[PDB]
Design a protein around this ligand. Sequence first.
Ligand code: CLA
Ligand code: CLA
Ligand code: CLA
Ligand code: CLA
Ligand code: CLA
Ligand code: BCR
Ligand code: SF4
Lengths: 73, 80, 143, 157, 42, 743, 73, 73
Amino acid sequence: AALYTHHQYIAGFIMTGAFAHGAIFFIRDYNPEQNADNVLARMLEHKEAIISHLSWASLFLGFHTLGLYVHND
Amino acid sequence: SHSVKIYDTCIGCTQCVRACPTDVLEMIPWGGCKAKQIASAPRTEDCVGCKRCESACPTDFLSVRVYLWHETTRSMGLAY
Amino acid sequence: GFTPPELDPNTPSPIFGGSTGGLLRKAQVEEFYVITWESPKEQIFEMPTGGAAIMREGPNLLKLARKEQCLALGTRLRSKYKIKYQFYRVFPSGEVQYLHPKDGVYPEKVNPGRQGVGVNFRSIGKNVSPIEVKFTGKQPYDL
Amino acid sequence: YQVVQPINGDPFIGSLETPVTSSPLVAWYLSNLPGYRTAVNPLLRGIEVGLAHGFLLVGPFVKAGPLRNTEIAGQAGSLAAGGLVVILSICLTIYGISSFNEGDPSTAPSLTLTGRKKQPDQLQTADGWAKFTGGFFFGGISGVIWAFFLLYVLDLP
Amino acid sequence: MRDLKTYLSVAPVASTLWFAALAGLLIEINRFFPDALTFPFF
Amino acid sequence: PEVKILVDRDPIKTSFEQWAKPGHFSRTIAKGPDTTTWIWNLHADAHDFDSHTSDLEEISRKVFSAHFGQLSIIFLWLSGMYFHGARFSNYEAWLNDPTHIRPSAQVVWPIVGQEILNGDVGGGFRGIQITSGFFQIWRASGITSELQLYCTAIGALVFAALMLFAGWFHYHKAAPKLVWFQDVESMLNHHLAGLLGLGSLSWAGHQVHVSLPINQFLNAGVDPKEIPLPHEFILNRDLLAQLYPSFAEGATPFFTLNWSKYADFLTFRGGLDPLTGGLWLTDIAHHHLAIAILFLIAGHMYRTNWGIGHGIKDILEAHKGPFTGQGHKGLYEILTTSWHAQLSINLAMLGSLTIIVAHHMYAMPPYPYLATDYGTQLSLFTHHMWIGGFLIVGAAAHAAIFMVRDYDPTTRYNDLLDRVLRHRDAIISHLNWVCIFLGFHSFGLYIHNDTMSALGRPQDMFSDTAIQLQPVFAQWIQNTHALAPGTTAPGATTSTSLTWGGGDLVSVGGKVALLPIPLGTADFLVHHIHAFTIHVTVLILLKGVLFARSSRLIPDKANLGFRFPCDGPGRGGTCQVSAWDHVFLGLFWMYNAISVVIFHFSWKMQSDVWGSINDQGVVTHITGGNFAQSSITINGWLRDFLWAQASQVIQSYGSSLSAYGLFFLGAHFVWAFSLMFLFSGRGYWQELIESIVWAHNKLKVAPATQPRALSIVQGRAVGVTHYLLGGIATTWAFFLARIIAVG
Amino acid sequence: DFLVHHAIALGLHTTTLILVKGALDARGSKLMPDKKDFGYSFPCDGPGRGGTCDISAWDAFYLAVFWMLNTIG
Amino acid sequence: MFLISWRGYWQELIETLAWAHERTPLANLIRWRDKPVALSIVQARLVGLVHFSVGYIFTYAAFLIASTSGKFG
Ligand code: CLA
Ligand code: CLA
Ligand code: CLA
Ligand code: CLA
Ligand code: CLA
Ligand SMILES: CC1=C(/C=C/C(C)=C/C=C/C(C)=C/C=C/C=C(C)/C=C/C=C(C)/C=C/C2=C(C)CCCC2(C)C)C(C)(C)CCC1
Ligand code: SF4
């Protein structure tokens, strides 16, 4: 039990850092004109469609999971 | 001392100078707008950084900008 | 080009009872401020530090500890009353410094003897990316 | 008539005068204490300081510590007060070290309550603060020793 | 009277009525067909 | 000068046109919405009367009729209580056997299996056991049939309609003017002598003629249906003279001044009734007589129209000395021109009064059969403590509003206010210090105790067995209260309460009503914790009030209002400088203090007061008496109080107490839900709303009233509201399930 | 196992939403189009334009740490 | 605390304390060398989050180890 919990919590912290340094990279070292129209700028170009669908997915999961738990209780 | 910068989209409404609580800003003559007026920031060693000026500017996007920078006694608002 | 007034000490002060909000050690060793105004008559007004004081008929001279205190008091004096004020910065050396209004006019009115400080001739959307200024000590808004 | 007045008639200094801060009994008392004996050698004042405070710090460590009832170790707990004296005199030393330098005058006020000049209090030196430190420390350890010396039964040992 | 007809169509009142009617409908359905876990018809 | 009625006719006309135009009161809202923020502002400023206008007359008219509306609502709620007692209750059977039937006045419909909530409450009835203590009131009133409950429900409904009509009338047809409101001397004369004097006189009358004889008959054992009706006691008087011979002379003594001959039913006994576990009714009637006399005399102090009396201005101006300058000169002008000053004083006093009511009603139980009904006693103490705390915090809110919007030394100058403003720095310094010192010396003792108990050193603890901290003064005072009857109170027989002592214990139905409460080291520790929490709450609220206008940090704070988010990130950052934010912070600390108070009372009563007594006379307390030895560490609070008593609520699934098990969990959820609003900020939320709005625009389904994130202040307010609701509801479910389950 | 696995999925999706939004909006958004000129971490942009508490990308990371802890829990 | 209370309240408190100290006898013979100020905004968020997750890890570790080690099964 100790080993499992230790390694899962360290993995979670490592994930949050992996994503933090992406935002640091986008602010500090990113150059728009040198990445014109490749996969990266294209990611930047439809950020609304990524965030909106992540939002839909997490709304759906939360609604139905909490709903079934409360039904059962 | 913080930094305050004025950009050429200014319409010279003077609303930012009226709002400053430490008298950082000023109006100066110009020729690029109907008011022949433009804001300037001659006294940034007294700026507390409240952004009261930015809340007052009507242009889109802003024409006055406050960049918080190295802190001093006057900048922190210390009476002791 | 608008000689500024002098500080005339022996100028009386308002009638105050004392308060724990006044000067402190910073005024002994670093700096403090002084405001002066006119007061057509004797009247009561709210101290920018504590309770209420009575300003005397004739010139008035107050010593405060921050520029913001002087300017808040001056704004109150200038709009609610119709009074002209000036304030100064005094160092522990015994050196005065006329502070406001700088060139004789109030800064919300454009005076033809002023230069531009901190003016960029472009929109704010036309600053370079930070990657353009990395490893050199400037800032993107510096230009 | 009113009792509270601004400090020395100046109503724009951040303080007041009361029967608590400016009263003849309080003024005379606070004047005759070591910290307020400006014209006296720093070491003598420090001696008074350390004496009084070692003697005072005897009691609590004895009557409250872990071995209060064990008296094959109850009384000799003055070791603790000696250690506390040592520690806060180390603290005195580092404070004086960081706050002063010998090649600089003493930061104390030069004016008095009526507007006459005084010779700045030398305790606020670097030199005189080290002197006062030695005095306080000497007094503290030997005051611990003194109040341990009086182990004779009185009213509450 | 017209002002009352308008007021009755303001957002909180309209939603109150809509949901009270919906609640009555679901309540009566469950009072007639209780404890349904499946669609037992076809 | 003189006092008279002054009214205007038809100031505002009854119409519906303003209902259809939302936000008529404020010019900014009237314009209509562009964004959703509008909808929030519309509700936040709905009752901010003195901000909709500048005229004092209009604000006072609105306040008067709003008060009538509130009274109409209260009457409707009372009507509901009486109707439910009359129609869906087991009150008659409980009247027959009070110590076996547990009261219940709410039944549920059988819709989705929820009829399991209709539990066996005894008496051939199945429903929800209530804890408001209404049966005890109705028994102390003399009510014995459901027809009387019906009658009072109908009367309350009538009175509610009357209040609503008067609320409409005094605003639209006959609206009093400012000079009418601003007459405080006649107002005080009426409320002192007319509302409180005549009220308690009339009530003493009802107790002498109805409650006393009907309760005498009930305690004699008579069937509650074979007792005469109350009005019989008034028509035939020999009925009364059989129970109280003094009713034969019948008001001849009251004039012949031989009041001694009334000692029949106007007594000064003290202590409890050993049959029902409540105060003697013959004591309560005499009490109300005395209180009525006192108030009727006190309502003749102030001068109105005939010279005789006291001028409030004269009293205030007369008081001043060499420490306070001119003090009290200028408070009559202030206390008659600002509603917020009045509201602050009134809220402070009413909150303190509610807390005092909680203490006195547990310690000297007024109603019969209330002391042995443990759930009702717990409920009443807890409810009233919460109400008192909330009102005290509102007092600070409105003192701050007065300081920001109304204080004005240019036209209304008072000396004492000015001097406090001129040494606020020393004030806040000393209060800050005493709270730090008090926090070290009370919670620190607990931490010392936990660490000594975990280090195998219990002889080094702060407890009754190792290092004693006995509250000598509290023990001394209750010993003086024990020896009082007969020595410093020769006219009393027993002392005021059974908690003082004397070795007297009262039992009812094999349960313990009251006995002497023992004070020990644990009582000393808990009380110093309480002093600590109250001092901290005071520090926060008083700092908010004293610095509402200006600071060394922001020297013109009064110009930013009473409720503003900040003054920007400069000066180091100035989030939460407003006085509203101080109220917001003080709510958390009030929650902390009251929660600890109700935990201390709940554990102490079960441990050393409540329980069951045997015929041989050996008292077994609900908990074993473990408060003296387990309350002194934090681990004992976590283990012996929370973990051990949450068992009842985490095991209620399947029983009639399962609603409490559902509410426990729901309240935990709402509490944890508020942390999201408390820990975050609106920039993130507006930027997320941007992308969601894009998605809606993609499908031509985007709304025209543009969605915004909540305000900064609204974020804080939603956060504290859900935090308080979650926490208080969790404790509510825990308490009610626990106390109902064991007994 | 079914129900708790869908709770785990909800946690992963919501933490991803927070971190991804913080990354993709770190160069600027509509409420602050010049955010890149201010750095990775800064308090706010004052109370103007409705209020801008917690608008930096550092602040998105700070919010996401809470959800990471909840998910690993 | 650090997460719900924000900076202005504390800064005003500290100004009060600085007055108190500078005015008291035998203790104003001692002078700090840095003017005390409340913590920063970003700093307060970081310190609050650190306390929160330290508490998180410590309480869960204690419970997990004690409830498995107590049964050892
Ligand atoms: C128990 C606490 C709690 C709860 C329930 C939530 C719930 C949620 N968070 Mg949140 N969060 C929390 C704590 C919590 N958070 C804390 C402490 C933090 C750190 C500050 C955060 C920080 C945070 C961030 C940064 C984000 C979220 C997001 C979300 C949403 C995710 C989408 C979803 O799951 O669909 C819905 C799930 C639910 C559980 C909704 C439950 C409420 C239902 C609808 C009740 C129904 C009402 C019912 C009819 C009765 C109403 C009563 C009446 C009086 C009104 C969701 C509503 C993300 C988001 O917005 O997604 C788009 C997001 O960006 N959270
Ligand atoms: C992490 C290392 C550490 C160690 C090794 C100790 C050790 C000790 N602690 Mg301590 N403690 C610590 C951390 C530590 N503590 C921390 C972090 C806290 C804060 C929570 C405390 C709070 C604490 C309290 C409140 C008390 C102790 C006490 C004690 C003593 C109890 C046993 C005893 O009676 O000795 C024998 C009795 C003696 C009097 C021995 C005195 C030690 C010598 C003689 C002092 C000489 C000092 C010397 C001149 C210079 C000082 C240090 C120098 C080397 C720099 C013991 C020597 C108790 C005590 O005895 O008080 C003194 C007690 O009251 N501790
Ligand atoms: C190989 C892994 C790695 C490396 C090399 C870096 C490197 C860097 N990171 Mg990064 N990061 C990582 C992983 C990593 N990170 C992970 C896993 C996370 C998620 C937690 C983050 C999240 C993160 C953020 C949000 C930021 C950085 C920043 C930075 C830069 C400066 C950091 C600094 O010195 O500030 C100083 C270091 C500290 C202040 C650490 C002291 C405070 C810690 C948190 C307290 C420790 C807890 C306590 C003491 C232990 C328990 C107490 C006790 C009771 C047991 C730097 C280039 C910062 C930056 O400057 O932007 C570029 C920035 O803002 N990182
Ligand atoms: C003996 C005279 C008398 C009495 C009994 C009252 C009683 C009351 N006054 Mg009042 N008042 C009086 C004289 C009196 N006043 C005078 C002379 C003035 C100034 C000229 C005021 C000015 C005043 C103001 C400004 C306010 C009150 C308010 C109240 C209520 C306080 C809240 C409360 O405790 O509710 C207790 C509830 C009850 C006791 C329920 C029974 C209600 C009975 C029927 C009240 C009837 C008394 C009233 C004077 C009848 C006159 C109306 C008549 C012409 C038809 C209360 C009912 C507040 C209020 O109006 O709330 C609406 C308030 O805002 N009074
Ligand atoms: C006699 C009592 C009393 C009265 C007459 C007032 C009157 C007033 N208060 Mg005040 N106040 C009081 C007590 C009182 N207060 C108390 C006890 C507190 C401490 C909490 C406060 C704290 C307070 C603050 C902080 C403020 C006021 C403000 C105001 C003014 C505007 C209020 C308004 O319309 O907002 C609108 C009312 C609402 C939006 C309703 C809020 C709904 C709450 C949050 C929900 C409660 C939950 C509910 C109890 C149970 C949940 C149900 C749900 C599950 C369905 C107004 C003049 C405001 C002001 O600016 O003054 C000028 C201001 O900001 N008050
Ligand atoms: C072999 C096998 C298989 C297969 C599998 C697969 C197919 C895999 C996978 C997988 C995957 C696929 C995974 C993943 C994950 C991912 C993640 C986790 C992510 C991330 C990202 C990030 C973190 C980012 C960052 C950034 C940004 C934000 C921007 C800038 C840039 C960068 C990059 C820095 C199966 C099972 C069928 C069966 C058995 C066998
Ligand atoms: S906008 Fe928010 S974070 Fe920024 S200074 Fe104001 S309250 Fe603080």
